[PDB]
Design a protein around this ligand. Sequence first.
Ligand code: SF4
Length: 208
Amino acid sequence: MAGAQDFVPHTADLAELAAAAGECRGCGLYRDATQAVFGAGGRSARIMMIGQQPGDKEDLAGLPFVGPAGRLLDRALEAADIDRDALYVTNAVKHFKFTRAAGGKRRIHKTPSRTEVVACRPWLIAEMTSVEPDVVVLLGATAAKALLGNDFRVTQHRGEVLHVDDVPGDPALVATVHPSSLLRGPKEERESAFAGLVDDLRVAADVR
Ligand code: SF4
């Protein structure tokens, strides 16, 4: 009766799950978005990565992390010697929540409410039980709070391997900055922040 749960089929197959998510009406976000954007990768992945939501490029590509934030993430993964093809990557919510400004060059993402995050979380649980990752990288506040609690502060736990007792399979969790946050700002601050993202990715990759 709650959120996305009745839309989630009783299967761990990622292709089946993604097809079903295309029909989800578990919150209001399906209405204005072009399509649901499920995760990408396969069930043998040892590392799962979760962002906030599909953005403007992802909403139309049908794949996660294809825009500028995704290209920065690719650069950080390469510096961390992680092959993106070996990951399962997804987002805490699966429809793009957005507005447009007059004169704007893109659709502008808006923050999912906690209500929307909780509504969509059945998909994330299905992905986690399907993939059985050894470690989950939480990119940004929305994703981290989805699993660690609404009060959790990414800025206060950088570099730490976390484990919480009601996440399925008890994977390690590593919460880090979202790559979109490193696209703008002073040069020295962007460079320090990028190095910190590489460090956190390496923490995740060194898990068992
Ligand atoms: S954001 Fe998630 S819960 Fe909401 S309609 Fe889309 S897939 Fe369903």
